[PDB]
Design a protein around this ligand. Structure first.
Ligand code: GWB
Lengths: 404, 535
C-alpha cells in the first residue's frame, strides 16, 4: 500500500530547471526512462504539472545510471520523527558501501505526491519538447524513500545481522555501509554473502588519523623565515590562545634584509618550543552538536594537493585532513575537487551519519558546468562557493605528513 | 477536435474574474454580434446565461479593415494556475542539421482547435453590450483554447506533441520542430518523397481538426529566424540597415548602439566607442546630440562592414567540433565555432567584463566556460579548443592558482596577441635586492593620511595625502616602494589586501591605484612581496 506523504507546512514543490546535458547523457536517460516507463515506475505528464527537478546520468561502471537531484524536494518533504547513527561504525577496520537504491521501485508512491517528483529530459538545441515524467514508485535520491522502506529494509537484514553480529550495517539514502573487523578476504567474502542475501529479493575508518600542525625547524633563520612563522602562529592563536609570538616578534625589530640571518634568543627558542607543545594536540572542548549544521571547507594547496576541515563552529574543528589527486586527475582541478567532495562526505556520513554543507574554492559556473562528469555517489551534498583566505591555506598546508 | 482536455485549475484558492463589460457603440456591438454567432456555430464558444458570475471585457478593433474582436484575459490569467514553462530555449541556427528539404506548415486556428477543460470554461465568460446599457447583453464562454489566455500555448503544444508521437516514430528519417503555430519539417528524402510525406502529415493533422493550409499563405524559403535567413543548405544573416539622418536623438543613438552591439557578434570589426560617447550627460531621450567627426566616421566604417554578406553552415554530426578564441584587447574576446575551415556555424564575442580584479588567463578561462556551456546546449558536445596561450603558460598559472579552474581538451594556436602572465612574484625573498618596509596610515574620517617606506639600505620617504582612505595609503606605500626601487625589490607589508595580490597576482583591477601598482610590478625584473601581521 501507499503511505500519505506531504510537504512541510506551506511548502510548494520544487521547480528547479534542467541543466543542459551531453548527447551521450541524454541518449542513455531516454533509454533508461522508456524502460521504467514500460515497467510502470514512471509515467509521462502534462503541462498542468508545473514542478521540476534536475536529472543527469553518471557511470566503476560503464552502463549509465540515472541520477536525480532531489535536494530541493527533500528539503521540502515533511519529516518522519530513520536510523540512529551507530557510534561503532567509525571504529571498524574496514567498511564497504552498497547501492540498495534499486529496492525502492518495488514500493508505490502516494499518488497525491507524485506530481512533485516531476523531472525533464532536455533535447539538444531544443529541437524537441523535453520529455516530462513523474514517479509512481519510491524515487532513488529522495529522503522519503529509505524511510518508507525502513520496515521492509530492517526485516530483510536481521537474518544476516544475527548470523554476523560483529558486523555493523548502516543506511544513508540509497547506500548501505557495512563495517567489520574481519580480515580483507573474510570481510569481502562475508559482504558478498550479504549481497547474495540481498539479491534474492573499501573504506578503513580506524586509519583516519587526526593530523597535527608541524612548525618548520632550521639550522639558521632569516628575517623572512621568522616573519612567515609569526604570521602563521598569530593566525593560529585563534585556535590555541596559549600560542605566543612576543619574543619572536622582538627579533623582528629593525629594517633589515629579508634574507639576513637572525640568531634566536633563548627566550624566543623557548616560546617556539612552548608553541610546538601546544600544537601537539587538538584543541579541547570540541564536541559534535547533532542539532547544528556540519560544515566542510576546502582549500586548494597546489600540485594536486587539497586540505579540508569539518567543523560546526569557527576554529573548533571536528576533523581536518589532506587529499592528494587520484591517479588520472593530473590536469583537472574539477575532477580532484568533486572526487574530494565525495570522499569527505562519505567520511562525514560514516562518522556522524549526515552530509556536511560545503564551501568550495571554485567559481559557481566552473563547478556547475562540470561536476557531474566526475560524480559517482548516489547522494549530493549542499555547497557554496568561496574565496580562500590566503592564511587559512598557509596554516593547514603546515599539517604533518608520514615519515615515509 | 477529439483531443483529451488538459485539467486546469485556478491559482491557490482564488476566484474567476468578475470585471465589468466596457461600454461600446451600436456599431462595435453589431460587429461582435456577427463574429460571435459564427464562433458560436464553429463550436468555439457557447451561449450561456445567468448561471455564471464570471466575466471578462470584450473589445472591438478593426485590423489592416473588417471589424474583429479582442477579449482581455489579463485578469483571468493572473488568476490561472501555473504551467510548466513554454519553450524559452529555442533552437539556434548553428545547431540545426542541413536538410534535403524543409517545409513550414502554418497550423491555422491552432488555439481554437483544441478543447478547453470543460470545468474551467466558466471563467472565460464574457459579454456583448447592448446599445448604451439597455437590457441584458449577449453572454458566452469558450470551449476551446482562447487567444490570449495564460494556459493556451502550453496546452496547445502538448496536444501537438501527443498528435505527432505516431507519425514521428513512423518517420524517423523525418524531423519536425513545433514552435508557436508553426511546424518546421525537414528531411533527407527526395523532393517528391518529401512532398508526399508532408501531405501525409498535413492529412494526419486534419484527422484531429487541424486545418493547416497549402497554396495561399504557404511560406517559402529562406526562413526568417531571429536575425537569420535559413536555407536548407546553409544560413545567411538578415542584412542589417543603419539609417542616415541629419538629426539624431538620444533614443536614436541608443537603439542604434543596440543594433550595432548585436552586429558585433556576427560581424567582425564593429565598434561603438564614439557612439556611446554621445550619451554622456544627456538630459532627455528626445534630446538631439550632434555626432562628432569621430562618430560620423565609425558610423561610416560600420555601414561598410555591415554591407558584407555573412553566410554560414549547419551542424554535421560526423565532423569534429572546433572553437578558436582571440583576445581582442583587454577583457575582450572573440570566438568562432566551425567544423571545416572558414565555414563557421556560429561566431560571437564577450564584452569587456570590467571586474574588481582578475587576470587574462582567468578571463580566458571564463570565455572558455561560457562557450562550453553554449556548445553543450547547441550541440550536446563541447568543442576541441584552439587557444592563444602556450601550454606552458597555462600549466604554470593553473597549477598554482588558489582557485579550482580548468579548460577542456584544447590546443595552442599562435595567433597573436597571445595571452600571457604579465609578471610573477618571487617564490622566495630576493638576495641582494633592496628591502622596503612599507606603511600607509590614514584617518578614515578626516581622509587624511600618510604613506612611506624605509629601506634596510637607508633610503626613506613619506608623503601626505588628503581625501584618501586607509587601503589607498597602504597601496600607495607599496606604489612608492615600487617606484623608488631598482629592477629587483623586496617589499614587506601588513596590508591584508596586498596578501590578496600575492595569492591572485591580478593584471587588471577596478582601482586605478591597484592598476598603477600592476604597471610597476610588470616593470620590475624581480619582486618578492611579503605580508606580516600589523601592530
Ligand atoms: C527539424 C529541425 C530541427 C530542422 C529545421 O527546422 C527548424 C527550425 C527552427 C528555426 C530553428 C531546419 C530548418 C532550416 F531552415 C534549415 C535546417 C534545418 N534543420 C533541422 O534539423
Amino acid at each position: 500500500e501507499t503511505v500519505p506523504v506531504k510537504l512541510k507546512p506551506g511548502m510548494d514543490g520544487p521547480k528547479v530547471k534542467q541543466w543542459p546535458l551531453t548527447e551521450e547523457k541524454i541518449k542513455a536517460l531516454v533509454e533508461i526512462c522508456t524502460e521504467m516507463e514500460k515497467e510502470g515506475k514512471i509515467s509521462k505528464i502534462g503541462p498542468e504539472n508545473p514542478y521540476n527537478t534536475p536529472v543527469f546520468a553518471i557511470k566503476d561502471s560503464t552502463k549509465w545510471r540515472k541520477l536525480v537531484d532531489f535536494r530541493e524536494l527533500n528539503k521540502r518533504t515533511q519529516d518522519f520523527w530513520g536510523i540512529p547513527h551507530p557510534a561503532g561504525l567509525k571504529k571498524k577496520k574496514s567498511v564497504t558501501v552498497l547501492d540498495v537504491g534499486d529496492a525502492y521501485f518495488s514500493v508505490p508512491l502516494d499518488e497525491d505526491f507524485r506530481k512533485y517528483t516531476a523531472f525533464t529530459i532536455p533535447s539538444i538545441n531544443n529541437e524537441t519538447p523535453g520529455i516530462r515524467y513523474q514517479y509512481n514508485v519510491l524515487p532513488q535520491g529522495w529522503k522519503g524513500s529509505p524511510a518508507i522502506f525502513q520496515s521492509s529494509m530492517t526485516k530483510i537484514l536481521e537474518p544476516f545481522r544475527k548470523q554476523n553480529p560483529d558486523i555493523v550495517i548502516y543506511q544513508y539514502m540509497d547506500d548501505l555501509y557495512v563495517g567489520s573487523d574481519l580480515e580483507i578476504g573474510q570481510h569481502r567474502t562475508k559482504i558478498e554473502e550479504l549481497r547474495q542475501h540481498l539479491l534474492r529479493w573499501e573504506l578503513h575508518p580506524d586509519k583516519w588519523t587526526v593530523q597535527p600542525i608541524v612548525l618548520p625547524e632550521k639550522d639558521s633563520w632569516t628575517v623572512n623565515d621568522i616573519q612567515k612563522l609569526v604570521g602563521k602562529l598569530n593566525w593560529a592563536s585563534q585556535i590555541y590562545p596559549g600560542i605566543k609570538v612576543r619574543q619572536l616578534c622582538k627579533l623582528l625589530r629593525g629594517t633589515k634584509a629579508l634574507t639576513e640571518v637572525i640568531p634566536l634568543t633563548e627566550e624566543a627558542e623557548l616560546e617556539l618550543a612552548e608553541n610546538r607543545e601546544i600544537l601537539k594536540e587538538p584543541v579541547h572542548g570540541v564536541y559534535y552538536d547533532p542539532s547544528k549544521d556540519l560544515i566542510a571547507e576546502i582549500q586548494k594547496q597546489g600540485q594536486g594537493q587539497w586540505t579540508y576541515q569539518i567543523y560546526q563552529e569557527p576554529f573548533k574543528n571536528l576533523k581536518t585532513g589532506k587529499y592528494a589527486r587520484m591517479r588520472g586527475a593530473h590536469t583537472n582541478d574539477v575532477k580532484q575537487l568533486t572526487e574530494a567532495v565525495q570522499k569527505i562526505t562519505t567520511e562525514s556520513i560514516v562518522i556522524w551519519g549526515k552530509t556536511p554543507k560545503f564551501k568550495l574554492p571554485i567559481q559557481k559556473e566552473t563547478w556547475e558546468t562540470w561536476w557531474t562528469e566526475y560524480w559517482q555517489a548516489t547522494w549530493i551534498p549542499e555547497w557554496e562557493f568561496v574565496n580562500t583566505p590566503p592564511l587559512v591555506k598557509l596554516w593547514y598546508q603546515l599539517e604533518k605528513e608520514p615519515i615515509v | 477536435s477529439p483531443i483529451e482536455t488538459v485539467p486546469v485549475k485556478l491559482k491557490p484558492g482564488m476566484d474567476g474574474p468578475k470585471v465589468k463589460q466596457w461600454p461600446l457603440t451600436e456599431e462595435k456591438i453589431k460587429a461582435l454580434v456577427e463574429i460571435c454567432t459564427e464562433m458560436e456555430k464553429e463550436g468555439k464558444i457557447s451561449k450561456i446565461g445567468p448561471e455564471n458570475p464570471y466575466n471578462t471585457p470584450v473589445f472591438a478593433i478593426k485590423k489592416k479593415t473588417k471589424w474583429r474582436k479582442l477579449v482581455d484575459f489579463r485578469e483571468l490569467n493572473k488568476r490561472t494556475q501555473d504551467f510548466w514553462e513554454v519553450q524559452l530555449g529555442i533552437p539556434h541556427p548553428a545547431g540545426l542539421k542541413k536538410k534535403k528539404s524543409v517545409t513550414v506548415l502554418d497550423v491555422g486556428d491552432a488555439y481554437f482547435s483544441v478543447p478547453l477543460d470543460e470545468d474551467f470554461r466558466k471563467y472565460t465568460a464574457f459579454t456583448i453590450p447592448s446599445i448604451n446599457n439597455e437590457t441584458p447583453g449577449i453572454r458566452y464562454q469558450y470551449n476551446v483554447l482562447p487567444q490570449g489566455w495564460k494556459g493556451s500555448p502550453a496546452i496547445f503544444q502538448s496536444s501537438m506533441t501527443k498528435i505527432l508521437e505516431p507519425f514521428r516514430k513512423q518517420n524517423p528519417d523525418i524531423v519536425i520542430y513545433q514552435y508557436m503555430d508553426d511546424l518546421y519539417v525537414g528531411s533527407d528524402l527526395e523532393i517528391g518523397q518529401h512532398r508526399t510525406k508532408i501531405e501525409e502529415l498535413r492529412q494526419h493533422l486534419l484527422r484531429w481538426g487541424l486545418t493547416t493550409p497549402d497554396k495561399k499563405h504557404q511560406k517559402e524559403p529562406p526562413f526568417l529566424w531571429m536575425g537569420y535567413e535559413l536555407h536548407p543548405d546553409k544560413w545567411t544573416v538578415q542584412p542589417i540597415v543603419l539609417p542616415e539622418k541629419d538629426s539624431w536623438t538620444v533614443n536614436d543613438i541608443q537603439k542604434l548602439v543596440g543594433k550595432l552591439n548585436w552586429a558585433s557578434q556576427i560581424y567582425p570589426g564593429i565598434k561603438v566607442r564614439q557612439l556611446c560617447k554621445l550619451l554622456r550627460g544627456t538630459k532627455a531621450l528626445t534630446e538631439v546630440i550632434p555626432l562628432t567627426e569621430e562618430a560620423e566616421l565609425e558610423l561610416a566604417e560600420n555601414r561598410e562592414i555591415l554591407k558584407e554578406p555573412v553566410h554560414g553552415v549547419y551542424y554535421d554530426p560526423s565532423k569534429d567540433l572546433i572553437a578558436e578564441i582571440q583576445k581582442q584587447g583587454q577583457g575582450q574576446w572573440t570566438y568562432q565555432i566551425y567544423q571545416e575551415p572558414f565555414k563557421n556555424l556560429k561566431t560571437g564575442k564577450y564584452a569587456r567584463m570590467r571586474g574588481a580584479h582578475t587576470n587574462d588567463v582567468k578571463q580566458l578561462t571564463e570565455a572558455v566556460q561560457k562557450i562550453t556551456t553554449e556548445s553543450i546546449v547547441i550541440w550536446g558536445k563541447t568543442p576541441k579548443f584552439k587557444l592563444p596561450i602556450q601550454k606552458e603558460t597555462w600549466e604554470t598559472w593553473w597549477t598554482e592558482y588558489w582557485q579550482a579552474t580548468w579548460i577542456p581538451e584544447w590546443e595552442f594556436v599562435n595567433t597573436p596577441p597571445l595571452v600571457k602572465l604579465w609578471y610573477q612574484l618571487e617564490k622566495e625573498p630576493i638576495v641582494g635586492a633592496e628591502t622596503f618596509y612599507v606603511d600607509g596610515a590614514a584617518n578614515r574620517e578626516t581622509k587624511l593620511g600618510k604613506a612611506g617606506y624605509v629601506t634596510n639600505r637607508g633610503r626613506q620617504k613619506v608623503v601626505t595625502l588628503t581625501d584618501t582612505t586607509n587601503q589607498k595609503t597602504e597601496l600607495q606605500a607599496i606604489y612608492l616602494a615600487l617606484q623608488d626601487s631598482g629592477l629587483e625589490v623586496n617589499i614587506v607589508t601588513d596590508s591584508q589586501y596586498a596578501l590578496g595580490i600575492i595569492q591572485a597576482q591580478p593584471d587588471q583591477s577596478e582601482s586605478e591605484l591597484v592598476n598603477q601598482i600592476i604597471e610597476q610590478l610588470i616593470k620590475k625584473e624581480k619582486v618578492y612581496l611579503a605580508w606580516v601581521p600589523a601592530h
